[model samples]
Target: PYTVVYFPVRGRCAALRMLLADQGQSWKEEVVTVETWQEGSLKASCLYGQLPKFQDGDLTLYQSNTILRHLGRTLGLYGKDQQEAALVDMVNDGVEDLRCKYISLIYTNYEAGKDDYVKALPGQLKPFETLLSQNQGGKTFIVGDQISFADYNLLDLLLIHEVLAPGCLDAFPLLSAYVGRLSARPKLKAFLASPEYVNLPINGNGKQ
Candidate 1:
């Protein structure tokens, strides 16, 4: 059984949670309450003093991307072979890179910096659109025909970006269609609509 310790917000855990749910896997959430976090009890015990810590049986893992790669390996979401795996990692890293920027803006100076961030987001998103264009004309998955873990992460990233800037994907027809396609997945659609997913803000601080 996998247990994830994180805050109530979606934060870095949404893609992983969606990965589990979409794949028909079961996991537990050991949510860290704001009061407990303020008290500095469990946070002090975490290896890197971060939320989104994960445990599977006896093995403990930190770092959101590490957990994703681990699960991608164990759960057969990585890819069929070496080249696809590399592409998968590349896409994941790209998504992470943008996500880092998005996270910084939302948490650091959202109200003051949002306009600028959104203005430049199209450029930030072009790489993914280009990647999609290069592969299957953005008709298939990010890397290959099958849905990889990168797709889940990318889907979450795109979803959140749309929240931050509505219709941001409109200029990129491929990305817009891709978002619609991934989101229409039955299990993932259900998970997205679930109370657990709907109840939380996109970030820890209540910003998008």
Candidate 2:
């Protein structure tokens, strides 16, 4: 029913994969190797020359967030109301901002920039903690009561960060518990532990 074309690494597509698995939807993975990407034919055909090309039936889409939001809308994961939907977008945007920085560090400047990045991480993560505090005493989802697409994206972000810096969440009790709670979801838990997820490196360069 669904097809995702991307590199084998767990990059932007991991969150959407989690969403699909947790929602109990089935999909196919079309892995793109570096050699194929270098060939340029598939890349030329891609709207954005990106790896995360998603297909729903005959409808093809580019951009990881667009795919996520499309699934969010189709699968009723956006939120319960317009206000909650907006908040969901807000949270996803925040996740994207951090994800961008993380990508930069992992792919471009891991050796030189890691120390500074880790040092600034707490301040960078504080906003999410603050957001959690304002919502349901940080016990429930990030925005409204129900889980939204943003939750999947945020979960992936927090997980990769933990890989980058061990005990990173120790300072954020809400985030730590949030990860634990979400990861324990029956379907998501199985997917996380599966070889499909576990076998892939967090980033393309073998960085965590």
Candidate 3:
């Protein structure tokens, strides 16, 4: 089976890796470093000459979240019904903030963002904080009644925000509470704390 190729950072491809791992599937963690991705074959012929391409046997698929949803459905954790499926799609839609939050990490260097940027960002996060508050289920999983891609997004949203990229978790208490609960999941906990956890850089997208 062809594995996704990118630097090990949790930027675009890590979610797919987590999805594959959640399914108990062994895949190649093909590491493409900055120098490699910028100058290597993996970087040379990407559909847009980009990094982070997914290779499923003979099929080479790009786009990170799409790949994740694909794996989630194939692995049977995506959804069991129409509503569940909608939540899966919702998670994908919900990721816009997630993506923006992460984009600031690399582009703006918000991992160490200055006071002004950091101060203003909470305004942006507050609405999302409120939106996530509407989840309305005490169980705290993102989709349906159990784990799904939405759950994974919730996990990454917090993990990347709090631990990996650094943010104020206190303001988003509901989100914080959700993160606290999700972090304890054996599979996610294992993945984040494993040697694989540090497999990505402390930084978001900069390669090794």
| Best prediction by lDDT | 2
On TM-score, who's better, 1 or 2?
2
Distance from true location, Cα of 184 in model 3, Å: 1.3
Q: Give the better candidate number (1 or 2) by lDDT.
A: 2
Instruction: Please give, for residues 124-164, the per-residue lDDT of candidate 1 as tens digits.
Output: 99999999999889998888888888999999999999999
lDDT values of the candidates? 0.93, 0.95, 0.66
In model 3, what is the error at residue 190, expressed in angstroms? 1.5
In angstroms, give how far residue 30 of model 1 lies from its true place. Answer: 1.0
**Candidate 2 lDDT over residue span 59-132, tens digit each:** 99999999999999999999999999999999999999999999999889999999999999999899899999
After best superposition, candidate 1 residue 191: deviation in angstroms?
0.5
> Lowest summed lDDT over 10 consecutive residues: which window, candidate 2?
199-208
Kindly report which residue pairs in candidate 1 clash with one another. none
lDDT of 1: 0.93
lDDT of each residue in 1-208, candidate 3, tens digit only: 7587776577766566666666577787677777776566765588877657887778777777767777777777778798778866866666756566557655766446545555665665565466566666434566556677766765665566565327577867777777778777667668768887665574544511
Clashes of 2: 0
